Copies of this chain bind each other. A is one copy, B any other.
Amino acid sequence: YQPPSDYKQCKHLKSFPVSELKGDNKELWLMKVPANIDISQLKSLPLDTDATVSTVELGSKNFNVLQNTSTQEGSDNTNLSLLIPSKKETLKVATSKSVYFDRVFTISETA
């Protein structure tokens, strides 16, 4: 296999830890957040892990929190898989027994 004309091979990827993943203590979150937000500047993400529709206050901006998982509509994500390298360019689907998502969120502006 050869990639396209202007796409260049990712060689020095950052290692995502998978020891702290599968745990009898930890989780695995996903954030469908708008591109407008600089997540580097963010100091804290104080949201509600046991409610469907809610409001996040991030700095001075009041976003509408929607839990994707706690809506029994798109309850299950067997579609989406996480990749990880074990060498840093050799990304592979994270292992447990195969890792699927738990809490998944989308935060919106004032429509």
Interface check A24, CB cutoff 8 A: no
What is the size, in residues, of chain A's interface with B at 8 Å between Cβ atoms? 3
Q: Which residues of B contact A40 (CB under 8 A)?
A: 8
Residue of B nearest to A40 (CB): B8
State the CA gap A8–B38 with chains docked (Å): 9
- Residues in A38-89 with C-beta less than 8 Å from chain B: 38, 40
* A94 → chain B closest CB, angstroms: 30
State the CA gap A40–B8 with chains docked (Å): 10
Residue of B nearest to A35 (CB): B6
Q: Which residues of B contact A8 (CB under 8 A)?
A: 38, 40
CB<8 Å pairs between A and B, sample of 2: A8-B38, A8-B40
